[PDB]
RNA sequence: UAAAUAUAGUUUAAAAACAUCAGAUUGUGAAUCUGACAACAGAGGCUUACGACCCCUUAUUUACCCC
């Protein structure tokens, strides 16, 4: 059961992170929304009630995350779950011969910093917070859930930076799980497919509709609540560890 | 009205008139304000049903020949689902084109200059043009600009496409091309342009006028590109082809195929293959 | 929710199948225990109450499965979920140079028949039964869950036959999901690792106890109830399709 | 170098097997074409010269393969390389709701027998033959190369049986490599994409053109000689073991 | 054939990069050693003869790589092959509860910058260089080969940073291959296991002997020449694209 | 100014063939089926009608530029 657990949810002011917060709070857990100051997380935290607070932070910053975790510990006393849902993307080809256009190095770096470096920054700091927990009857001190993408396995044209960052999350899932196994922290990764999030809504509507129609079943965009349901299942299942779960309706992305 | 009885006498004179004329066709006969205008419309209705009957008669013949054949009368890697699979593959390429493809604009600001017949043919050419783009190895990101929602051109497009219209991987907008792209990047194609196109530029947004002027109106397309200070170019038809007859204003489907060939590193000899052979005597 | 759903659980008289039956029945579902006549499934079905019946069948037999599905339809009116948990294992090296011993072809064939062909036999027949269902609000007619193994990815010495069968289940998961997507049947696979089933207890105590310590976290054999929990999560989550979920506590099997 | 090596090439009368034979014989190796009696194997062996012999066999038969391997030992004295290229493909949907058609069990079984069971049958018997070899300076006694498919990873609609069989080959690659590691027999698998085999080239030119256009780069069907080149690379490289190599021009098959 | 081809090899002054240069130059290709100024690449380039030049560059900086590629173009006229072998590693646990030690963010960033960002920086710039090539008879303008690791799949304890960087390389291999497919640039990745690189030969003999014994077959560290051989095979085979090849002697890393 | 010319997807012939659009889960003739589209430059006429003939506009090509 997730009742009484404290979850730090990165990127929790919108999209997958917010849906995770709404579900966990609705199921009796406490949530800390870790998102940027401009994200509007304060309004979401107030909407979710007294068991949810907003912690303004940039995941790329060690100091910001440290402040957020201190806020989480101060309000709720401990951290049991970390969900990494903050992420950005760019749509940029590696190189376009016809246009003579090269992918910017800064664009690649910015995506890595938030998606990959930001995830690791949260992981390494929340693990220290989780390490202070007394183990439960099963010896578990915490659960960390990361958000990869199906782009980690079949990245599309223009998704090189995003795929690299998400492939990095997939790559480090097992080693970190092995790192934190002695202290009883499970590390799991969800690789969502096409979900009704702003990351996909920014695409042209016709492109979004076509992509949604290409999901085998159900032929629609993923509902963020469906992501939240899987997150809860991972928290509740003590034997899921070091694994990536594709949540994509069986889609395989073409170029 | 009186027209219902009025047409009856025309049939008795054998003036190339169809047997059956639907009510919605009688309304179109109102627009015909002259004897010649009516004559041309009836002749159109006559030949329309005649080719319908001819093809239909050939359909029962085809159907009858199929059934007689069947009455007289293994390891595979794939199920026969190619048409469906090809459609899916084009959609993925179309989705990619809407994000990274070179824009190509069909300017739909010519409804006022076209009659019913010309507007019908414009949509037919647009249907073909979009089809060639869709199947191409490197599709354009097609833009339908200056397309009024309630306009005749939009209504006909919806009629021909049905539910496909909302799923077409192209951008249709009421806004002009000048509102979507930098003016320096826009090249307005028109045969009346003084500047002859030499090379296909991948950083430029070419604009094609969706204007089938059977009643020729020279300079209309050029005037639009001068009202808003847009660069113009014309195809090098005289430079490469020994022109003999016919209008130098090519159809929409021919234009996109020429542009598609040029975009894919084809030279002017390959690109100008889509110019109708009847109009020239070869490549000089 | 699984309340009111009818699940056909292959190999449901013991091990993972039985635990799945106990959970689903406890959550308000109806279960049909499909297992061999000598498996003792009648006693288990009686123990689970009126919402559980025993259907004796061999999964390798088309007629046996047809009879079992007819029994399921007669008793409960429909089939909503199929869980394939029947399986066998053989410990035999491909070739032993020292002993001059070669893996027998019949041992390989028998493992394929039960694990791989038996799974497909159930899938192809239950799909017809689920096809008769009216689609739910989400357009779904049923869920099929298969049991692969971590041996499909890291097969140990002597597990050639087992790894082939489980690799086959992994391989056909996506095509079958694609096959049944128009019908609205989701196809999912669980790849367990080192569970406290009677199969693993049949190993010497020293080997299994050592194997328990080899699981990174939790350092114990998988609880069959944890498999059942994941099965329920898959049933409840509408967007899980065409995917293999490793349930192994982050273990990676050594030779 | 493959000069002086003896290769047993299953399905060597046509397609990938024949191309492998032509390359290896051209590079100074000896080849044994193991294929069905009805194949034109005798004509191909005569065409390839005195370093190639035809051994009629059915891979599903232990007796047939034993006879073929005895012929290889009699003619050339040893077996150094085994290339499994025999296989069949069927296209059949698991279940078709509109037609009320169910995939036949026999169709599934016959694909497994040839593709999967037949491959293992050759592996287990050639391993015994290779075990008799004196180890080379690197300790290697032989190399076994199997042919999976990209269908093992992304099987299309109607490819359930084919994908299961090919997924089984992928699954058992590592365990068999681990099984034969003390003996010094490397086990490797190639997963070809769309290749210009007679099965594909017999399709209508419209279908062939479309399939070629589906390969990202090069946008053509795979040349069987390219498969043969990879086989030689695997034989020559002593450190390739227990791995599946996709040879597909970066294609990912759509449903 | 690689005769006459021009290869840019990052990290070409030592280890895998140097072995690749020696093989390609020996086979008639031209090599550019792209390595740090202090790497001693000038001596290696002089040793390899007139068809090898040293280009001092840091892969993490756009200016340095641009200068190196300009040197390659000036000396040899074109670039046909890019081999990314530049890389570093750190050994640091994510979090150590006993010592209260947390992985530094700087260590993670440094490994990401060189291994992942540096690889992409080379890829995006060499792609522009190869884009200027006239396509060959097969339509190919170039081949890019990246070096991931087995750590991208099973990273060990303390390898979080390394596994993330290598998982990123694996993740972006397919999207970049898809990006460059219209240009005719093949993108491939090699995932080497334990190789006798200077980093591993300098590791303690106790760990080194054990890890070498842990390779199933051959039970020894990978020879850098074997990496070079695979690189050549990738260059010569026109149909290998968008794939990761494990070169590890069938090892699967323990925690 | 004069004479020939002008097929709006293409060509042929004096109505076809090839194409185009929508639908299709096609068991390998889908090599099909059901629909959509159907305008020989344009306008106006003459005629029992004709794509004939008579006019005007526009365009193309070849001659020619003031009597
Ligand atoms: O009567 C017209 C025209 O026939 C004649 N004319 C024009 N160009 C030439 C030419 O090259 N050679 C000859 N022999 N005759 C020619 O001159 C008359 C008046 O000229 P246009 O009407 O053709 O041209 P304008 O600029 O007057 O324009 P517009 O009246 O047609 O609008
Ligand atoms: C048949 S033309 C319309 C002719 C109209 N009289 C006009 O003023 O352009 C249809 C469109 O195709 C394009 N087009 C046709 N022929 C062209 C040519 N030779 N050169 C350039 N563009 C041409 C133009 O954009 C034009 O608007
Ligand atoms: Mg025309």
Numbering used by the authors:
A (entry chain A), C (entry chain D), D (entry chain C), E (entry chain B): 7 to 261
B (entry chain F): 92 to 164, 175 to 385
The authors write:
Here, we present several cryo-EM structures of the mitochondrial RNase Z complex (ELAC2/SDR5C1/TRMT10C) bound to different maturation states of mitochondrial tRNAHis, showing the molecular basis for tRNA-substrate selection and catalysis. The human long form of RNase Z, ELAC2, has two alternative start codons to produce a nuclear and a mitochondrially targeted form. TRMT10C is a purine N1-methyltransferase that acts at position 9 of mt-tRNAs using S-adenosylmethionine (SAM) as a co-substrate. SDR5C1 is a moonlighting homotetrameric short-chain dehydrogenase/reductase.
The TRMT10C/SDR5C1 platform in the RNase Z-HCCA complex is similar to the RNase Z-HS and RNase ZH548A-HS complexes, but here, ELAC2 pivots by ~6 degrees around the tRNA. Within the complex, a tetramer of SDR5C1 forms a flat platform that can be bound from each flat side by TRMT10C and precursor mt-tRNA. Thus, the SDR5C1/TRMT10C subcomplex can support the simultaneous processing of two tRNA molecules. Furthermore, the structure shows how TRMT10C compensates for the lack of strong D arm/T arm interactions in most bilaterian mitochondrial tRNAs by providing structural support through its extensive interactions with the mt-tRNA’s D arm.
